[PDB]
Write a protein that binds this ligand. Sequence first.
Ligand SMILES: [Ca+2]
Length: 263
Amino acid sequence: ANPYQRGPAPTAASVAAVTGPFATASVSVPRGNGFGGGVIYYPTDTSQGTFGGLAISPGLNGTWPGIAWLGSRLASQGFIVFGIETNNLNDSPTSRGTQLLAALDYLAQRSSVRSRLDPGRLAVAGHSMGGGGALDAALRRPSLKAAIGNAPYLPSNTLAGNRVPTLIYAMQNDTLVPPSRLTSLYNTIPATTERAYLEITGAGHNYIGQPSTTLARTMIPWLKIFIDNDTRFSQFLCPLADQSGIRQYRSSCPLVPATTRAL
Ligand SMILES: [Ca+2]
C-alpha cells in the first residue's frame, strides 16, 4: 500500500466539493517567527496517520482572509494547510518566499499541530506576488514536494533549475500577470520536472478572491499526486477529465511522483 494515502477513492464530485471527506479544525497563529502568522487548517482524524503540509501566501496588499476559502476546502481532502499573513503588505516576491519557508519551518517544529504533520512532505502556493514567492521558495528548497502558483508574479520569470513539481494558473483576462508571461514561465521549467499550466476562461487577476471549484478541483489532484504520491488522483488530470472553465491545459502527463530519498 501507499503509506501516505488518505481518504476514500475519489470521484469528480469529491474533488469539486466545498468540504471533502475529512472533518477539519483550525488554529490562529499570531505574528512572529519570521512572518505575519496566519491560520492552520487540519484534519482532526489521526487514525490514518500524519498528513503532508501546504503553506499559502497572499499577494501585494493582500491578507489571508481574501483567499482563505482555500484553507478548509483543501485541508478537508487530508492536508495541513497554513494560510499566512506577511510581515508587511508591501513585501516582495522573494520575501514572500522566505516567509512561506519560515511558515513551513514553524509548522513542522513549533506549531500546535506539528504532531499531525509529516515534515518530509511539504508544499508551497500563493497568489500573484505570493505565487512568485512560492516559486522562489521552490527554487531555494528543492526537497519541497509541490509548488502551486496562481497568476504568479516571479520577477525573473524563470524556473530554470527548478526540481519541484509546479502547477501554474493563468487568468485569461489578467494584464498584470498575462498568460503570455505565464506561458514563457512554464516553458522554462526543466523537462525532467513534472509541471502543468491551466488557463482559466474569463478570469480577471483577482478571480481567486472568490471560491472557485475550477481551481479547487484541479489543485486537489496535484497536491494528492505529489505530496502523498497518491496516483488515485491522476485520473483527474491525465487526461483532464472535465475541461469546464479551462481555456488551455498543458502538462507533462503521465504525472509521476518523485522517487524516495536514497537510503
Ligand atoms: Ca511525466
